[PDB]
A paper describes a structure:
The Uppsala [name] mutation (Δ690–695 in [name], Δ19–24 in Aβ) is the first known multi-codon deletion causing autosomal dominant AD. Discovered in three individuals from a family in Sweden, this mutation gives rise to a dominantly inherited form of early onset fAD. To summarize, we solved the fibril structures underlying the tau and Aβ pathologies in a transgenic mouse model and a patient carrying the Uppsala [name] mutation, the first known multi-codon deletion mutation in the [name] gene leading to AD.
Subsequent cryo-EM analyses revealed the presence of four abundant polymorphs accounting for 43.5% (PM1), 16.9% (PM2), 14.4% (PM3), and 8.4% (PM4) of all fibrils in the dataset. The cryo-EM structure of PM4 fibrils, solved to a resolution of 3.8 Å, reveals that, in contrast to the other three polymorphs observed in vitro, PM4 fibrils are composed of two copies of two identical protofilaments with a high degree of flexibility in the N-terminal domain between residues D1–K28. Accordingly, the ordered core of all protofilaments for which atomic model building was possible, extends only from G27–A42. These residues fold into the U-shape. The protofilaments are connected by hydrophobic interactions between (i) G35, and V36, and (ii) I31, G33, L34, V39, and I41. However, they all share the same C-terminal U-shape formed by residues K28-A42, which folds around a hydrophobic cluster of residues A30, I32, M35, V40, and A42. All polymorphs are different from the ex vivo AβUpp(1–42)Δ19–24 structures and different from any other published Aβ fibril structure.
Numbering used by the authors:
A (entry chain A), B (entry chain E), C (entry chain I), D (entry chain M), E (entry chain Q), F (entry chain B), ...: 29 to 42
The structure:
């Protein structure tokens, strides 16, 4: 999938 | 997928 | 995929 | 893919 | 692909 | 200050 | 100040 | 100040 | 001030 | 001041 | 402020 | 302010 | 302000 | 302001 | 202001 | 069925 | 089915 | 199915 | 299927 | 299928 570090407040479907 | 660091507030489908 | 650092507020499909 | 630093507010399909 | 730094507000397909 | 509706995931200094 | 509806992912100093 | 609808990903000083 | 609809990714001083 | 619809990626002083 | 009939699910600043 | 009939799902600043 | 019938999903500043 | 019938999905400043 | 029937997907300043 | 994140004000038949 | 992020005001049959 | 980010006001059959 | 970012006001069959 | 960024008002079969 996606690779994300230190994300702020977001929305993720995954 | 996508590679993202320190993202602010976003939306990600992944 | 795409390579992104310090993104502000965006949307990503990935 | 694309290489991006310090992007403001955008949308990315990736 | 494309190389862009300090992009403002854009859209990127990548 | 600022008036905001339905802000997603943000940061606000306030 | 500013009046904002449905802002995504943002940063606001306010 | 400014009046804004549906702003994506932004930064606002306000 | 300014009136804006559906602004993408922007920065606004306001 | 200015009236704007669907502005992409901009910067506005307002 | 605002005066409303039969709005579905919305958001209002008023 | 705004006067509304039968709007679906919207956002309103008014 | 604005007067509306049968709008679908929209955003309104008014 | 604006007067509308059967608009789909739009954005309106009015 | 503007008077509209059966518009699809638009943006309107009015 | 359908997969939806952060839907505003909508209607879904499902 | 369909995959949707941050939909505003919509209708979905699903 | 379809993949959609940040859709405004829409209708989707799915 | 189709991949869509930041679609305004649309209709999608999917 | 199709890849689309920032589409305005459209209809898509997908």
């Amino acid at each position: 999938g996606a690779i994300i570090g230190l994300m702020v407040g977001g929305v993720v479907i995954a």
